[PDB]
Amino acid sequence: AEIRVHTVEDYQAIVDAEWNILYDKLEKIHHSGAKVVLSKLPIGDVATQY
Amino acid sequence: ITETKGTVLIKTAEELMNFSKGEENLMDAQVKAIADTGANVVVTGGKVADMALHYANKYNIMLVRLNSKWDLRRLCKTVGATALPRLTPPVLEEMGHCDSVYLSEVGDTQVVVFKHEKEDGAISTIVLRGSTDNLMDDIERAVDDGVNT
Amino acid sequence: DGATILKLLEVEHPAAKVLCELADLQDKEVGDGTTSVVIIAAELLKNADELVKQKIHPTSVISGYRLACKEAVRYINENLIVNTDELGRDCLINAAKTSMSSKIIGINGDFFANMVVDAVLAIKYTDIRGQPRYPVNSVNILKAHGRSQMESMLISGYALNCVVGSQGMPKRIVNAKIACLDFSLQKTKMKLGVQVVITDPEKLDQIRQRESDITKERIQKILATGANVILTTGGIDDMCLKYFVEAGAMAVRRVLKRDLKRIAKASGATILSTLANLEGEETFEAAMLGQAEEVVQERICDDELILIKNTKARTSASIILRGANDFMCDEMERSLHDALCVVKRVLESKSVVPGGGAVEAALSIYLENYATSMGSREQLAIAEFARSL
Amino acid sequence: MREIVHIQAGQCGNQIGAKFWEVISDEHGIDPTGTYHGDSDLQLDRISVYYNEATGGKYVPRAILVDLEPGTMDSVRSGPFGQIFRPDNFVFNWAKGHYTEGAELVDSVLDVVRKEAESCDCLQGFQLTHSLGGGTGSGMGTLLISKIREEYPDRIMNTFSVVEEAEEEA
Amino acid sequence: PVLVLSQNTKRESGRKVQSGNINAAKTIADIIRTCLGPKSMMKMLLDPMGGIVMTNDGNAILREIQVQHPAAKSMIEISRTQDEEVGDGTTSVIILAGEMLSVAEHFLEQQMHPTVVISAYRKALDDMISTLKKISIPVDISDSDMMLNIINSSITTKAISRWSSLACNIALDAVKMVQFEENGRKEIDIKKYARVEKIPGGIIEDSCVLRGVMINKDVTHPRMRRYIKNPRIVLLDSSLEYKKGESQTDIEITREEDFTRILQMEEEYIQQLCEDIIQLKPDVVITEKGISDLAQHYLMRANITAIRRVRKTDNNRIARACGARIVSRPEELREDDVGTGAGLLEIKKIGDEYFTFITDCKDPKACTILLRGASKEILSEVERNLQDAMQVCRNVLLDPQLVPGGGASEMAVAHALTEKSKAMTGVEQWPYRAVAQALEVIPRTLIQNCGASTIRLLTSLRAKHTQENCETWGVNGETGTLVDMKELGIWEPLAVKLQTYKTAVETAVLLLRIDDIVSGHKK
Amino acid sequence: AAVKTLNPKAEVARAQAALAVNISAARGLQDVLRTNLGPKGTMKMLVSGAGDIKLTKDGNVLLHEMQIQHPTASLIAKVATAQDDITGDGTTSNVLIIGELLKQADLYISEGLHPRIITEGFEAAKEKALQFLEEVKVSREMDRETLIDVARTSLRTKVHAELADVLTEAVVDSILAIKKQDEPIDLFMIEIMEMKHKSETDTSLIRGLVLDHGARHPDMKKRVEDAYILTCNVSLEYEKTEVNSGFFYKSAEEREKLVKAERKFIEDRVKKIIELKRKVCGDSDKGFVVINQKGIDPFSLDALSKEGIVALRRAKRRNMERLTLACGGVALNSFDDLSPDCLGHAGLVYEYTLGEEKFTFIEKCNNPRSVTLLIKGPNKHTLTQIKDAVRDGLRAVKNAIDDGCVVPGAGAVEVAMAEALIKHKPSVKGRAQLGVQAFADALLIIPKVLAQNSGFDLQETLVKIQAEHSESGQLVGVDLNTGEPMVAAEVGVWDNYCVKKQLLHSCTVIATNILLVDEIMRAGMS
Amino acid sequence: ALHVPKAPGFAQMLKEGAKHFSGLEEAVYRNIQACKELAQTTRTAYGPNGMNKMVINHLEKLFVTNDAATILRELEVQHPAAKMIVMASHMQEQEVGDG
Ligand SMILES: Nc1ncnc2c1ncn2[C@@H]1O[C@H](COP(=O)(O)OP(=O)(O)O)[C@@H](O)[C@H]1O
Ligand SMILES: Nc1ncnc2c1ncn2[C@@H]1O[C@H](COP(=O)(O)OP(=O)(O)O)[C@@H](O)[C@H]1O
Ligand SMILES: Nc1ncnc2c1ncn2[C@@H]1O[C@H](COP(=O)(O)OP(=O)(O)O)[C@@H](O)[C@H]1O
Ligand SMILES: Nc1ncnc2c1ncn2[C@@H]1O[C@H](COP(=O)(O)OP(=O)(O)O)[C@@H](O)[C@H]1O
Ligand SMILES: [Mg+2]
Ligand SMILES: [Mg+2]
Ligand SMILES: [Mg+2]
Ligand SMILES: [Mg+2]
Questions:
Q1: Does G97 sit in the ligand 4 pocket, CB within 6 Å?
Q2: Minimal CA separation from B19 to chain F, in Å
Q3: Which of B32, C255, F116, F370 has the lowest CB atom count within 10 Å?
Q4: Which residue of chain D has the CA closest to C262?
Q5: Taking CA E316 as the corner, what is the angle to CA E311 and CA E320, rounded to the nearest 5 degrees?
Q6: Greatest CA separation found in chain D?
Q7: Across the strands, what pairs with G45?
Q8: CATH of the domain spanning B1-149, picked from 3.40.50.10420, 3.10.129.10, 3.40.50.720, 3.50.7.10
């Protein structure tokens, strides 16, 4: 990937988009009712605190 | 992917939020299109992806990966199928038929078997059991001489 | 040549390195007599060491040497001869002959002295007129083995160790218009900061064409003023040689900067590092062109060189030396440099002095007589200076 | 896919190429006898860029060996990992007449590289390993790069070359 | 601990240095003195690379030897200076220098300062030159028989003497066709436009000189014609193919059609170039660079024959022969750059190899000499001999004067100097006579190589020259008698003799001035 | 010595030592090479450092594979190489005659003579011998029987009779089949191929072409009974733009669109070929074969195979001309102007497999101007020997056609020149008569060597041969199975005129140049 | 003592380390010996009652067989005559596969 942008408002939106994506995945996991989560791939500190 | 170098370029946030979802939906559509024809087992000669494996398991598709570039041709001769150089749902003429396909264990060895009931077939295999690799090699040479005779 | 010998030798003793650098300094300052000063200095040391071996303090010897040197320098201005009193041409010729004696060109003294004096006089510069100047080493000296040394020639003009750019060009121009340039004539290339990015494919052909068209436009601008000879320090591309070939003009590349400077000043041209003017556009004006009476390419002993003859803005001279082989040619050049320097010094300062040891004998007699009037321990040092002379 | 073929020229060039092929073979799952032991699939993903698989599971390198000596290629063969090369991938007095020396050697090399490029599907380049300042790298290498370019003037050719008082008015 | 002044420098001085220099010069002279005259024998040399050089040329002998003594190096250098200046006489110069330097130690050992000897030599050289100019003979350059006689007398010493009639004709035709005058009045006879091609095989009598050029090249595509009667030739310095620029350009494509459109524009460019070439309606295209397959297709569609990758010098010779000029940008192609002076283009096979002939030119200014023969060594020797003959012819054309050979000129000059010396007083008289009597080594060596009585023949010849009109009497090298050179017919250019004498005397003067040697100072 | 005082590490051999060294080297070479001459010569085995085996009888191969480091040997080897590459035969006789000339010259030089007298005698004898050879030759129409005789004479000296009889017909037929009555014969139009099985008596001539590669796609047909042939050198692989380019997409759908769009350039050419095939071969009765000098992608291979096309990729460049000459089409670099007039016709195309190798046969051409010689045998050295013999035979037949004349053989010509020179020599003045005698005695070496190899007495056999040809003016040579004199022309032993001419010239020139060397010196850098 | 220096000609012009054999006594009778020994080596593995043979190659790999072609392939032969016999055997194996 590569990001090309012209304005600071779009810059801020781009910054917010990644947090939105990660939180969307986390909420999708949470709303299923699961109480234990296991993964083969790294679980970040943000995910751990969430 | 493209043969030439490619790059995903994004100028807004909606594209960033939609790219992965679109890719996953496209892969799901392709796999279900393959599965709709009635295929039970897919044989490939190269790498498999995690998402493709996930959808194949979802739709109850047996996936076998063999890689010699000659074993693939021999299997095609055995079953009656034609190798497809692009990932597209096969036509009936390109579809192979085998009676039994399974995984078995013989003497600490995991094997995958494609088996017919036909007495003719196209090819056949001889499974040798011995207590020593040298003895098995000698029996192999004897079998070769018999075939040549 | 003493300076050359001492420079080629490798020495480990600093007391000897002092004499080596003394010879080098003499060569830089004057250009003649780099072998006599070493002998004089060594003899002075040898004679002072005996007095030091006797119970004489070195400070007395040093003061005596300083006093003797001062008196000798003052007295030498009595043995002077004013060159204007003598007839100038034979005075200069005799000075040159004396300088060239004891070299490989000794017997040909009159021939080579006439050549040297002619070159030095032709290279004279017109200063503020307070003092005229004679800038030697502005003459180009070339070596090429072959015929006998008495066939070495003086060229009224300039000589270039360069050949024409392409074999399709003419090799002789009668009335020469000269343009001297200080930049390359290759196809253009955008700088590091600039880059080309294409999103509409239809726009590539015209960019590729303009890349080659800019230099053609420059060359047409240059040639529109009637220039016949183009001299360039940078390179010239194969695509750009064809324009000169069709126009019927000579192009020379990889010319040395000092050679270009001398040619430009001799022929009245102006050196250009760019075609821009005091406005935005680029122009070439027939006002900044040199004029020469002939430009030829001449063959010398299986190689080629270029002669530019009878420059009109000023006068210039060059020398081509012929010899049996490279060693002889190099020695001839080294021997000719001394004569050029001697003639320059004589012309700058109109005073000459006899040679053969007369000066040393007179100085020894005078200092020996003068040593008595001191009546001290400096008398011994002064006498030693006189005897070592 | 994207097959690349290799040329080795000269004594030192042959030795360097042999070392490179040895080390790449140990990195992959390839062993001296031409079979496979590697446990990671990533050792077999791009095996076809450097190897041709023969009927029976054996692998051969996509390499060409050239020298004007009957001893260098023999030394490579005697040395370890020298038997894995195909026996016909070798090219072997110095100066005869003929008005041109080496014209048959270069033709043999061109024929062998043509036969090798026939087997590959979508080849992309040639990796040439030779001495640069050497006689075989300048003269006896009779513009072999130029010959290869003339033969295939569309593919890349990557070569590992061994390395004043007058200051008045104006 | 070790106190030194000049580390490991070896110094030698005195009479030892002069004796060593003279001995080294005499040794260099002694190596070669068997290769003078029509009765000379060959020498075979083994070079470091593994070849063989079977030759008789003095410069070829001397340049293949490595020596340590600097006097030997000086003699080796003067040999090649003579070879570059005139091309003939590289053995007589060495022999003469050896004798002129050998006759000096007699006066050195009798406590005579070298400066007197130098002055005497420089005085004698001028009187040598004056006598040589006095005894000259004029020659008419329009007399082909006289020119052939001169060339035959020049090559009657080498191995091509069995085919002198062929060799002389080849050399004369080549020189005459290469002679050129152009813009201004710069007359020149540059011999980089007279190529020599050696092809082993056949017979030597098949050697010839062509009215045109021959190259080792073939047609790019088999369907092109290999025989054209009256062709129109165009020469190019550029490549007929698509190549990248140099301004660091990149392409960014985000649509479907851009890739195919970009791929098509290259073919469009190639077609434009090919059509621009075709507009002139030529028959042959020659280029020093590559030619693409699509360009070949278009040219063949237009019935053109193309040649790839010719050398720059060969392109220049073709241009000078056919009258065309090289063009780098086809857009700037005119009717003037098309050469029509050819008369046949052919492509033949000579022993499993293809060759291209451009022959039957109307007025060519460049030529190719084609030599056939037994093998490379013989062809190389023939090439060297042909170079000697051609340079002799060029010297004759640039200066039409002749002097008798066989030693007649040497004996005449010696007699003149001996007669002039008796009007001199002082110590210089003895060296002045010594040089004149040292000029006799050439007839003495000729007599020795013939195999006769030097003691009798030399004094007989001296007595004959003592008379009044006998300046052309000399030695016949095949039998060993005295003969007038007028009836025999041996003459040589004046420039060769002048260069020989000047080089010999100046080398002796240079070597007589050394007094000490310093070695091992590491730059 | 003078050279030693300047370079102590130099090596030198002066007047007599140089001559001794040269004569010794020449005699040493001829002593080994004299056993090859004639059909009765023996076979030499050569083993290299790598362990390879080469059985040979040819003089040039022996010279360049025997282990020797002598300068005179190098000179003689270069001369033999020139002889070989120009004429194709006579390499052994060159060395034999050079050695005999040097020996006979030294025989007289040892008594105080000077080499120049012998040199002049050599020149006069050479002129007389050339004059005699110009008249002894026989001019004929060069019909098939004469060519068969010449080829059999040239081939019988390398292999046994059973294989020579097989090779002669094939060589003569190929030469006649690629010949037009103008435009001198151009080789490279006969292809030499070797297949390792089916013992050499199966070597044959194919009126077509054999290619050492076959079809790469499994589903392509293995045999075509009536084939159109297309020959091209256009590229059907994926190609990248010369200028740097890259795809910039936004989503997976756009990526798919670009992936589809990056193949139209090659798919267009494939479509053009397919349309031409469907236009010409309407029904499924004929076949279509494509030969390409460049690569073909798997996608293109599948697309072609779906319509019954047999495609071969990466053929050699000379095959572009050979296929055109044989089938009768046009080799083209572009598909812009494709038309049926660019196609060729072939009556049969099929495929053969040898373990790991594959071959393709194009056969039954209408009027082929190019053919192929298919060599077979069970050994690599057998194949190499047969290849060398085939080269010899082809060169001999081509030279016989190029010349209008052929010459009797088996030493008759040497006997005749010796007899003529003996009678000529009294006319010469001076001591050159000794040189003439030496030249004749050197010329008399070939019949002596032939008799010695056949197993008779040299002196008695030569005396009988000279006893004839003097009482009867016939040209008389040696019979190798009885030792009696015979007439070469009636029996059928022939030789080339150009070979003899070149041999005489080269031998005389080399002997004359060798005899005049004064010293041998190695004084350069090591 | 004294030495027998060399013979003039080819014996002196031969390279160092090279070998030149000629005549019936030095070539034919030695080639026959080499071929006879090679045949004797594998004579004992012929027929139903042939005995197995164990060979270790240059890579320390172990072979146990009584097949003549495998034995000859695993052995390394330095004599040219035995090499030609080996190639004859290999050609027979390729052509038929038994014998
Ligand atoms: N004709 C002459 N007669 C006497 N002395 C001379 C003559 N020419 C030069 N000299 C002397 O030669 C010396 C110059 O020595 P030299 O080595 O030639 O130059 P330098 O040492 O000055 O570089 C001076 O002392 C000068 O007086
Ligand atoms: N037929 C001849 N008779 C007598 N002297 C000859 C004859 N031909 C050439 N010469 C002499 O031989 C001398 C040397 O010529 P050559 O041996 O070719 O060597 P170079 O030409 O290099 O000096 C010439 O000065 C010439 O006078
Ligand atoms: N059947 C034959 N009877 C007599 N002489 C023959 C016969 N065949 C060939 N020759 C002679 O053998 C000579 C040499 O031929 P060969 O041994 O092949 O070597 P090369 O051809 O290289 O000299 C020829 O000159 C020929 O005359
Ligand atoms: N039962 C048997 N009785 C007698 N001879 C046999 C029997 N079986 C095989 N043979 C013989 O063994 C011979 C050689 O067979 P083998 O030992 O396998 O070596 P190869 O077949 O390679 O020559 C054959 O000629 C065959 O006749
Ligand atoms: Mg001075
Ligand atoms: Mg000469
Ligand atoms: Mg023969
Ligand atoms: Mg069996």
A1: no
A2: 6
A3: B32
A4: D166
A5: 150
A6: 88
A7: none
A8: 3.50.7.10
Do D153 and E290 count as a contact with CB atoms less than 8 A apart?
A: yes
Domain boundary assignment for chain F: 1-140+405-526, 141-207+369-404, 208-368
* Radius of gyration in angstroms for the set of CA atoms belonging to chain A, rounded to a whole number: 15
| F430: number of Cβ within 10 Å | 10
Report whether F315 contacts F216 (CB < 8 A).
no
CA dist E297 and E286 (Å) reads 16
Pick left, alpha or beta for residue F38 (phi over 0 → left; psi -120 to 50 → alpha; otherwise beta): left
Distance from CA of D167 to the nearest CA of C (A): 10
* Domain extents in chain B: 1-149
Nearest CA in chain D to F216: D119
Task: Nearest chain D residue to F64 by CA: give it.
Answer: D93
The answer to whether residue E138 neighbours chain F at the CB level (below 8 Å) is: no
- CATH code of the domain covering residue C192: 3.50.7.10
Q: Exactly one of E131, E314, E388, E445 is catalytic; which is it? A: E388
Question: Which of E319, F232, E326, F61 lies closest to C238, judged by CA?
Answer: E326
CA distances from E68 to D39, E72, E76, E512, G82 (A): 68, 8, 12, 19, 57
Q: Identify whether the C-beta of residue E43 lies closer than 8 Å to the C-beta of residue C51.
A: no
Chain G positions touching F51 (Cβ under 8 A) are 78, 83
Task: Tell me if residue E503 is catalytic.
Answer: no
Indicate the length of chain E as a whole number: 523
* E283 labelled catalytic: no
Ligand that lies nearest to the alpha carbon of residue G46, given by its number in the listed order: 4
Q: Does the annotation mark F92 as catalytic?
A: yes
Please state the atom number of ligand 4 nearest to the C-alpha of residue G68: 22
Give the CA angle between residues E42, E44, E49 to the nearest 5°.
155
What does the block give as tokens for F427?
């006319």
What is the assigned CATH class of domain D3-161? alpha beta
C-alpha closest to that of C105 among C329, C300, C347, C319: C329
3-state helix/strand/coil string of E38-105: CCCCEEEEECCCCCEEEECCHHHHHCCCCCCCHHHHHHHHHHHHHHHHCCCCCCHHHHHHHHHHHCCH
Q: Do E43 and F85 touch (CB under 8 A)?
A: no
* Residue indicated by tokens 């027998």: G4
Instruction: From chain F, pick out residues whose CB is under 8 angstroms from the CB of B2.
Output: 247, 255, 258-259, 262
Ligand 1 environment, Cβ below 6 A: C 2, 32-36, 98, 101-102, 355-356
Question: For chain D, what are the domain ranges?
Answer: 3-161
**Closest by alpha carbon to F26, among G8, E381, E50?**
G8
Q: Are E420 and E127 in contact (CB under 8 A)?
A: yes
Q: Which chains contact E through at least 3 pairs of Cβ atoms less than 8 Å apart? A: C, D, F
User: Is D69 annotated among the ligand-binding residues?
Assistant: yes
SS3 label, residue B65 = strand
Phi, psi torsion values for D52, nearest 5 degrees: -105, 130
Sign for the CA dihedral angle at F147, F149, F152, F157 comes to: negative
Query: How many CB pairs below 8 Å do chains A and B form together?
Result: 30
CA–CA distance, F68 with E170 (Å, rounded to integer): 39
Q: Quote the DSSP letter at residue D47.
A: G
Q: What distances in angstroms separate CA C358 from CA C65, C94, F130, one per listed residue?
A: 21, 17, 88
Q: Does D165 touch chain C (CB under 8 A)?
A: yes
Closest CA to C267 of C291, C300, C288, C284: C291
Ligand showing the shortest atom-to-Cα distance for residue G68: 4
Catalytic: E57? yes
Determine how many CB atoms are found less than 10 A away from the CB of residue F79: 26
- Is the beta carbon of F329 within 6 A of some atom in ligand 3? no
Token representation of residue F40: 């009765």
